[PDB]
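agent> fetching stored inputs for the magnesium ion docking request
agent> found them:
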Amino acid sequence: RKQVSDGVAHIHASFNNTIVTITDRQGNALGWATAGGSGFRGSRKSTPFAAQVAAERCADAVKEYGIKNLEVMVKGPGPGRESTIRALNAAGFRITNITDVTPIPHXGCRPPKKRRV
Amino acid sequence: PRRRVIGQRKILPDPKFGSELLAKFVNILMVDGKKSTAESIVYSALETLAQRSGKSELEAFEVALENVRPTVEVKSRRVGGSTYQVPVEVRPVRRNALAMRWIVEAARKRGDKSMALRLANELSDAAENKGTAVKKREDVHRMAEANKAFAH
Amino acid sequence: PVIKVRENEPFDVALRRFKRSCEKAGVLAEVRRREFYEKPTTERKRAKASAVKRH
RNA sequence: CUUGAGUCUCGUAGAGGGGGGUAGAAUUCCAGGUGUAGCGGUGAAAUGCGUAGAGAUCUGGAGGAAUACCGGUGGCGAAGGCGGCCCCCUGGACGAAGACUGACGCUCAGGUGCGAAAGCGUGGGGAGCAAACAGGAUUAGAUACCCUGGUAGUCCACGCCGUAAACGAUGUCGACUUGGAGGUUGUGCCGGCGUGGCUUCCGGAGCUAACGCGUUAAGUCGACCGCCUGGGGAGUACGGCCGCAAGGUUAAAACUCAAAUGAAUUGACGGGGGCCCGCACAAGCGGUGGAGCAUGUGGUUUAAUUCGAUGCAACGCGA
RNA sequence: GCGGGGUGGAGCAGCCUGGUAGCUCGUCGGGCUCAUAACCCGAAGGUCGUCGGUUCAAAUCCGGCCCCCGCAACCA
RNA sequence: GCCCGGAUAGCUCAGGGUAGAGCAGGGGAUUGAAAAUCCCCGUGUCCUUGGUUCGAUUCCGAGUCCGGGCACCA
RNA sequence: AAAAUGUUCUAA
RNA sequence: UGAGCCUUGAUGUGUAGGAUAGGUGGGAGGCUUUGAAGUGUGGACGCCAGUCUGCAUGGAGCCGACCUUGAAAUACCACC
Ligand SMILES: [Mg+2]
Ligand SMILES: [Mg+2]
Ligand SMILES: [Mg+2]
Ligand SMILES: [Mg+2]
Ligand SMILES: [Mg+2]
Ligand SMILES: [Mg+2]
Ligand SMILES: [Mg+2]
Ligand SMILES: [Mg+2]
Ligand SMILES: [Mg+2]
Ligand SMILES: [Mg+2]
Ligand SMILES: [Mg+2]
Ligand SMILES: [Mg+2]
Ligand SMILES: [Mg+2]
Ligand SMILES: [Mg+2]
Ligand SMILES: [Mg+2]
Ligand SMILES: [Mg+2]
Ligand SMILES: [Mg+2]
Ligand SMILES: [Mg+2]
Ligand SMILES: [Mg+2]
Ligand SMILES: [Mg+2]
Ligand SMILES: [Mg+2]
Ligand SMILES: [Mg+2]
Ligand SMILES: [Mg+2]
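agent> prediction call returned; pasting tokens
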């Protein structure tokens, strides 16, 4: 509906999947797309390409809204951690402030036991 | 091989057209080491194609060939027990050889009377993107584009 | 790793600066080290092994 | 008597200990806003969450636990151990000058105290993690590894337990015996010259079965203590003491074997690491396995179906 | 006295609803392997406890007998 | 008996102007087998009939069967 | 990713 | 914030075609400088084929029936 032109991209990129959501500067989500929904499942859900595809099909999800000043707020140690920004730029968004908001505990809670593979 | 000292082998051109590509075609269609029979079959099929196409006797062959060449192949690579088939580009000589082999094996998998008729039909059908060799090209392209994520 | 793109700064070098900043801040190293719990004896042994190898 | 031991004076560093308070990040939950079809997980999946609106993003709130960076083969402590910041109480160590007591020392069976984690009792607390447990996979099976959850427990107060590869596998105290490179703490004189404490690596003599140790000795000695006497049986049984219990501690014998063992050497092997090669893969072409026949073999049969070869490297082999 | 059952070598379906005998393991033959197990590809294997009857046709439906599981056996 | 629903493929379900969306099955591909995923293929009077307009499942009429609610249930 | 085993004595 | 009602403004591109045309219609001329074919800007919908546009500049045109549709052009105009 209402154009915004000053949104923000949240890229939750983990080791298994990439979730990219274009929201407003108030945090209100406008659109979202995942590597698992772009058309990938399994070893392909976690490929830097899948995150690129998810970002490029999330960009065209938010077309009725504003486009001018998307900014990236990537989070998580995902394989699709920079290809998402590539796709966002290729879609036609100028990135003003690109930042990392990965949650780092300052100690925090005990992590799960290590996998014995 | 490990040494990788292989070079290139010169193939004498086709006597009737002076083309190394058509010589390679005659040579691929060979069975049990018979240059003369394969050459006769290729010549007859090309004459039929030229008569029914009106382009040329070598340009029409290249037109049919262009519509069946693959622009990308896929090479297997196991990672964790499962396969990770990675797409790779195909060198021009390899894509020529692949298209030519596909055309020959598609012509062999037909039901016409003689091999010359089978091959002429196959090239005519490939020039229109309707033969089974073109179907194999399309399947290879689609399956190499499906797992494009692995093309690092 | 908060960086604002400079006035008329090209995009590619901007996220090159972003990658350099996050590498300097060690975000990915911290996340990798916090994925699983390392027993204190294991952490001490790893530190000792790193010290011995470096020396 | 002062040189061992200790006291006093000033100063220094330190995750040394006990108590109280507080801060930020993060994980969980609760509510509310936006938003839509997947999240999550794996080697791949599925269980599990999700159209009752999840995941994602933003706002407010609750609670528990641990303190990223600093951070360092750094520091402190007898050992176990100790890591945000602040305050209160408190132990020890070290240094520079002196003054003081004047052998007041060292070790120590029994004794006493401290003593990781797990565990136990009572009362709280419970975010995350996670024995037991359930489910999904994997597998021939999988009472496991992997995944999804998850209770004791992990946290606090008090009281038990008193064991660990509680290890430097090296008891404590004192003296003596070439060096090198550091780290961390004081200190004098004048950026250098000296001087103490603790600590890391290398290495000389010497020692050791060797590996190695080597002024922080496993070198040369002295004092005292603990401990060993082949491998199993067995740190077990019985008895004693201790414990709420789990169990701890002290601790045999019959029987049985001719070994068990430590270090190092040469090979071999590794689902250890490298650097290479081979129709070994990859790229291709043609076959075998199907049919009929030939031939050899096994088996069966026969009076005999001669004997031998019989993984690769026997089977159109001796022939 | 009442109910259920008997089907390849083993354990279970097919019986209600007469014409259509299946699943897993096991066995045999060939593969992989230095061999065995696992695994892979093929095959054989039960005329249905027995007898009688109906029906064109019975494992099936109905009766007798045999064997085996249960259930019941109470008031004195 | 009335009211509310329908009848679409080997199977589950949409949609006056097109017969389709997916799942099974076969095949190609990788691959030791099983995989996920990739690609190709079909599976119809859209229950029968009558009116409709330039045709009809699509608007309606008469029925058959397949599910709920209610009523008589002596 | 899964990948179990190798009768007794003798070692020429 | 639905539900229902009354009115306005357009919506409903089988198949032809100039035409994002369902039926019906008094009936085939109004509109126009009471600033008009050509417009820049802005908005609505769109299976994006084609319609509406607030105003500017611009200047005064636009033109129905006639031909391929099963139907006829919103030139004036009425009921779903
Ligand atoms: Mg995990
Ligand atoms: Mg110390
Ligand atoms: Mg004692
Ligand atoms: Mg404890
Ligand atoms: Mg309790
Ligand atoms: Mg289980
Ligand atoms: Mg678990
Ligand atoms: Mg407790
Ligand atoms: Mg002990
Ligand atoms: Mg000891
Ligand atoms: Mg040394
Ligand atoms: Mg010694
Ligand atoms: Mg003994
Ligand atoms: Mg005991
Ligand atoms: Mg006892
Ligand atoms: Mg040894
Ligand atoms: Mg090969
Ligand atoms: Mg044969
Ligand atoms: Mg013989
Ligand atoms: Mg002999
Ligand atoms: Mg067999
Ligand atoms: Mg073995
Ligand atoms: Mg053995």
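agent> quick read of the result: The first helix of chain B runs from residue 20 to 29.
agent> awaiting further instructions
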